[PDB]
Amino acid sequence: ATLTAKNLAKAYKGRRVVEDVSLTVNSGEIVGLLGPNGAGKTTTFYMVVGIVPRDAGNIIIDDDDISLLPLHARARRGIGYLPQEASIFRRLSVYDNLMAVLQIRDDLSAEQREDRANELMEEFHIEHLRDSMGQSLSGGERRRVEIARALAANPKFILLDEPFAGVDPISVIDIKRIIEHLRDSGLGVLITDHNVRETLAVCERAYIVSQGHLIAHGTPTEILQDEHVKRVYLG
Amino acid sequence: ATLTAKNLAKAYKGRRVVEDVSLTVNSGEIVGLLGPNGAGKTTTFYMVVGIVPRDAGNIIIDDDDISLLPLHARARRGIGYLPQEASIFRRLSVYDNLMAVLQIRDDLSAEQREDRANELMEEFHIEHLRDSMGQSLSGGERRRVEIARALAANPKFILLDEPFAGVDPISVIDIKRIIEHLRDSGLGVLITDHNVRETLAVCERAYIVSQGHLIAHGTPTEILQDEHVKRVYLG
Ligand SMILES: Nc1ncnc2c1ncn2[C@@H]1O[C@H](COP(=O)(O)OP(=O)(O)OP(=O)(O)O)[C@@H](O)[C@H]1O
Ligand SMILES: Nc1ncnc2c1ncn2[C@@H]1O[C@H](COP(=O)(O)OP(=O)(O)OP(=O)(O)O)[C@@H](O)[C@H]1O
Ligand SMILES: [Mg+2]
Ligand SMILES: [Mg+2]
Numbered sequence: 001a002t003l004t005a006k007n008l009a010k011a012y013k014g015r016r017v018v019e020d021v022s023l024t025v026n027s028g029e030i031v032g033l034l035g036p037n038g039a040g041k042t043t044t045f046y047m048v049v050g051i052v053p054r055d056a057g058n059i060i061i062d063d064d065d066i067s068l069l070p071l072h073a074r075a076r077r078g079i080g081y082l083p084q085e086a087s088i089f090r091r092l093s094v095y096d097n098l099m100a101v102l103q104i105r106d107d108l109s110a111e112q113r114e115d116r117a118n119e120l121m122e123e124f125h126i127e128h129l130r131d132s133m134g135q136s137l138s139g140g141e142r143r144r145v146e147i148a149r150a151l152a153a154n155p156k157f158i159l160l161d162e163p164f165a166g167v168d169p170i171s172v173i174d175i176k177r178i179i180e181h182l183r184d185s186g187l188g189v190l191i192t193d194h195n196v197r198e199t200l201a202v203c204e205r206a207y208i209v210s211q212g213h214l215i216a217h218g219t220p221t222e223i224l225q226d227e228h229v230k231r232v233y234l235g
Numbered sequence: 236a237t238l239t240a241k242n243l244a245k246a247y248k249g250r251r252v253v254e255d256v257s258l259t260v261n262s263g264e265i266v267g268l269l270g271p272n273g274a275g276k277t278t279t280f281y282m283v284v285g286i287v288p289r290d291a292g293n294i295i296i297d298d299d300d301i302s303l304l305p306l307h308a309r310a311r312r313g314i315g316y317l318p319q320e321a322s323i324f325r326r327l328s329v330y331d332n333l334m335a336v337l338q339i340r341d342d343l344s345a346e347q348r349e350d351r352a353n354e355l356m357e358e359f360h361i362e363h364l365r366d367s368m369g370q371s372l373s374g375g376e377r378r379r380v381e382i383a384r385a386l387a388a389n390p391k392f393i394l395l396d397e398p399f400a401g402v403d404p405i406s407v408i409d410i411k412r413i414i415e416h417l418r419d420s421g422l423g424v425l426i427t428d429h430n431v432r433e434t435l436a437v438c439e440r441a442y443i444v445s446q447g448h449l450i451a452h453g454t455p456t457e458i459l460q461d462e463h464v465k466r467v468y469l470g
Contacts (some may be wrong), residue, residue: 051326053366071327072334083326091286091318092306099307103339131288 001027001062003079003157003188008047008057010040018043019212021057023190025157030179030189032199032206034223036233039209041192042084045159048190049081050074080155084162088142088149090135094126097134097145101152120148123178125171139166147175157188164195176202196234200224208233236262236297238283238314238392238423243292245278245447253278254447256292260392260423265414267434267441268427269458271468275447276427277319280394283425284316285309315390319397323381325370329361332369332380336387355383358413360406374401382410392423399430411437431469435459443468 003025010018018040025031033041046052048059050071058067061077069077089097098120102113121127124144129137137145143166150158164172172195179189180202193199200206200220208216208229216226223229238260245253253275260266268276281287283294285306294302296312304312324332333355337348356362359379364372372380378401385393395414399407407430414424415437428434435441435455443451443464451461458464 046326051331070334071331072338091281096286096306099305103307 002060003048003190004058004060005044005048006058006060008044009055010043010047010052011055016212018047021209021212021214023207023214025188025190027156027186027188028183029204030183030191030202032203033190033192033209034194034196034199034206034233035192035209036211040212041209042161044209045081045161045190045192049079049159075153075155078156080150080153080158082147082150082158082160082163084165086142086146088134088137088146091133093131093133094121094129094137094145095131097149098152101149104153107154116152120152123174124148125174140168140171143167144171144175151178151182155187157190160189160191160193162193163191164193164198172198236313236391236423237295238425239293239295240279240283241293241295243279243282244290245275245282245287246290251290252447253282256444256447256449258283258425258442260425262391262421262423263418264440265418265424265426265438267438267458268425268444269429269431269434269441269468270444270450271446273446274444276444277396278447279444280316280396280425280427283394284314310388310390313391315385315388315393317382317385317393317395317398319400321377321381323369323372323377323384325368327369328366329356329364329369329372329380330366332384333387336384339388342389351387355387358409359383360409375403375406378402379406379410386413386417390422392425395424395426395428397428398426399428399433407433 006022008018008021021044035041047054058065066074066077089100092100095117098117102108102116105113108116121130126141126144129141134142147163163175176198183189191199203220205218206223207214208223210232216223216229241257243253243256244251256279258268270276282289293300301309301312324335327335330352333352334348337343337351340348343351356365361376361379364376382398398410411433418424426434435458438455440454441458442449443458445467451458451464
């Protein structure tokens, strides 16, 4: 129901890239995290997901501090994650890519894994790429496959690190509906992207980060005229 | 059990890189596939595992033709695979890398996954790297982690594609001992590597391929005396 990060801090050498960052995502809502290149968004995703150790802070699900849980146990509790950088298996076919994911699924039979594979391919308009290898896909084809992989894991909370990069405008609409639809079924989404228009359109609320600190919080319409935010991020 | 490949063939352009290759491994044996760079060893491995389509040939386990099964279904039937190129997750720690694989394990409870993790890390002498990230490891540390990952999947048959590249001589001896131990437990092994002396030492018999044809077979002593093998491979 509730995923909360409190007082996250991270430094490299001594560059404070995240300091005292707190945020919350509830199931059945889409929440943004936006900000300048290097502001510390991917780093906060790392700390929530469990891939770098934090300098300070706590990760909580439903009044349960899971800060000491390793990555795999946090994923078992429902945290999913789409990396920013490419993560498709380059030698595997699209279908193989999604099946490697659906292997983890103790809630689906062999037949239901099959159908879920086809279903995702049809939803993302990639069924014609079924037997294409990862390495032979175009930039947007590859990204949409990676989004489908991350969804195929059926998380409770999904952190999407720049899902729209390389993605055409029509697929960006299509993906927004896939995500809206899963939100309706209780999926919590934390999303970052620099396609600000399309991202804010689907967000119920959003956080703004800049040089490692939160500098704003609220609706799309609100964020779009916070004076600090126009100066440091929007133009 | 018995894993057989029969009459495998594969061509790219007007270059047939594998032609009429047949191989077999039984549980409880270690078998080599050796031969010049480009001879078609990795290509054969891809056809057995299921990542490249075959031009001709059949894959059989015991009395079952599994040629039509996809990669995930062949792995469920007990085919395992260590890729030649790097496959570690670069942003995960050694421990996370191991746990991500031990997630697929229906036969181990959460406590038993973690004992298997520590057990693997101590057998490969990598426990001091437990929380080091994939990308910051040396070449042989990275390779040893990749072998542990492939064995963590508990296959019935494992195809090891150049496991000793980058690995120091002491760890080579250690790895030979770890796989001889799993051989004694019923694991079948198909191994290819250019450390000829060390690889033939643990093989009971081997095949020599050159330009995609089998040109020799037999014990290590037989392989090493064959004049065809000296000329095209040993030099
Ligand atoms: N291992 C590292 N060592 C030193 N500095 C690092 C390391 N990793 C990241 N940084 C720095 O920390 C800052 C923030 O990294 P981060 O990836 O969190 O940015 P981001 O908010 O995701 O931005 P973008 O919008 O460009 O993706 C960057 O300026 C980056 O160069
Ligand atoms: N996609 C491709 N297109 C064209 N040629 C290819 C392709 N993939 C592999 N080859 C060629 O197939 C031949 C066999 O490759 P393979 O990877 O099977 O060799 P190997 O026996 O594994 O050699 P090494 O001992 O260097 O790993 C090579 O000469 C390679 O150049
Ligand atoms: Mg980033
Ligand atoms: Mg090879």
